[PDB]
């Protein structure tokens, strides 16, 4: 499923990401935009055999299990296929765990590059929440 900008902001707010660990809502919307273009089906295979899954491009060597990643961890304790659902709940719950890792949203390269330090509120401007 490809979410609309405001449609995604609404779902993430529902799921409690607004100001989660101090990150206002637009941070998460901006992260999804550049990580997956708001597509819950986005997958990107990496040279190490791992794959990034879903709306927030969560990696199979550390966060979920896709059975193709040899000696990997599964820190969110879920099958990576769970991160490809129309329902972003699994992705949001795992993202909460990732952002509680010790470095906040810096764990997302795309957020660090395209969102960190910008006017993230613009990503929710014009939306009804």
């Amino acid at each position, epitope marked *: 499923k490809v979410y609309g900008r405001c449609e995604l902001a609404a779902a993430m707010k529902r799921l409690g990401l607004d100001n989660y660990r101090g990150y206002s809502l637009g941070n998460w919307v901006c992260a999804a935009k550049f990580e997956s273009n708001f597509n819950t089906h986005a997958t990107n295979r990496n040279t190490d055999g*791992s794959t990034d899954y879903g709306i927030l491009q969560i990696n199979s*060597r550390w966060w979920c299990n896709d059975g193709r990643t040899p000696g990997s961890k599964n820190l969110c304790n879920i099958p990576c296929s769970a991160l490809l659902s129309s329902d972003i709940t699994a992705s949001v719950n795992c993202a909460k765990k990732i952002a509680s890792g010790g470095n906040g949203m810096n764990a997302w390269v795309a957020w660090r590059n395209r969102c960190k330090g910008t006017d993230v509120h613009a990503w929710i401007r014009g939306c009804r929440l």
Partner: nanobody
Amino acid sequence: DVQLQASGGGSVQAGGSLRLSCAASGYTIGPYCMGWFRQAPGKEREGVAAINMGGGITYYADSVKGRFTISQDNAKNTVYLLMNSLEPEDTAIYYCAADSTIYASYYECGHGLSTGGYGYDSWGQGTQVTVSS
């Protein structure tokens, strides 16, 4: 409260080889990246080699490609830097470093290596390497 302990180093004649080692302890999860940076008195600090602990993909400064090799024991959160065909220009204080961030999406450890050490948050005390003529 993680610690990076390095071994190896010292003096060696040009053309010679040295292997440095660095063990990361105190981690429960991670580190995500381990690498070596070097600093010679009158130069900019240089990222020499790095490796994604998860996966083993490696990265190298152009100045050492084909001469140096970084690898991990993994089983013990330890990495090795095998340096062959040393030149006097390789003389420097070599530092083991690590990036403790567990990234959400795939991250190439060579990025922080080539951009000033960005993301490498933990550092060893430095090991002198002197390559004599």
